[PDB]
Design a binder for this molecule. Structure first.
Ligand SMILES: Cc1cc2nc3c(=O)[nH]c(=O)nc-3n(C[C@H](O)[C@H](O)[C@H](O)COP(=O)(O)O)c2cc1C
Length: 147
């Protein structure tokens, strides 16, 4: 199994999430390519991947904005090869904002509309990812089954 993890992270929380999930899937024997969304090109981005995991934190006060690096990729997602792709999504935010990890909800909606196959409900981390390290490792373990 070949996985691609793309993450948008401002303060490092989701990047630490994506590292932790990449180590879990590498430990289980998946090939893993993990990339900062700021370095990537939407063009056929997901071709050849058995599993694609997209991580993005949430910004904004009364509106949901996606993490700033991730926006460009999000806007071209139809250009990626997501139809039929087995995909899941994750992100850090904070339960005291009106839309808690609303970026994870906006990337899942867009992915579902594309015919993506979401194997697992989104990982939404409230607070510091280093405290929810346990739920991060189990979510990765669990996405390896939805497959
Ligand atoms: C100004 C501001 C606005 C934010 N808005 C939201 C939000 O609407 N929903 C949410 O769940 N978290 C929100 N957050 C929480 C951040 O997503 C959280 O701090 C996250 O740990 C950042 O992840 P990052 O380090 O990967 O970019 C906000 C944080 C700040 C400072």
């Amino acid at each position: 199994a070949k996985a691609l993890i793309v993450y948008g992270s401002t303060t490092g929380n989701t990047e630490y999430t994506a590292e932790t999930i990449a180590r879990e899937l590498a430990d289980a024997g998946y090939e893993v390519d993990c990339r900062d969304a700021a370095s990537v090109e939407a063009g056929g981005l997901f071709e050849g991947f058995d599993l694609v995991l997209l991580g993005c934190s949430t910004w904004g006060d009364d509106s949901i904005e996606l993490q700033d690096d991730f926006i460009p990729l999000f806007d071209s997602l139809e250009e990626t090869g997501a139809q039929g792709r087995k995909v899941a999504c994750f992100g850090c935010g904070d339960s005291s904002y009106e839309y808690f990890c609303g970026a994870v909800d906006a990337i899942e909606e867009k992915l579902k509309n594309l015919g993506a196959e979401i194997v697992q409900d989104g990982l939404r981390i409230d607070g510091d990812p280093r405290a929810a390290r346990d739920d991060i490792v189990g979510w990765a373990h669990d996405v390896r089954g939805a497959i």
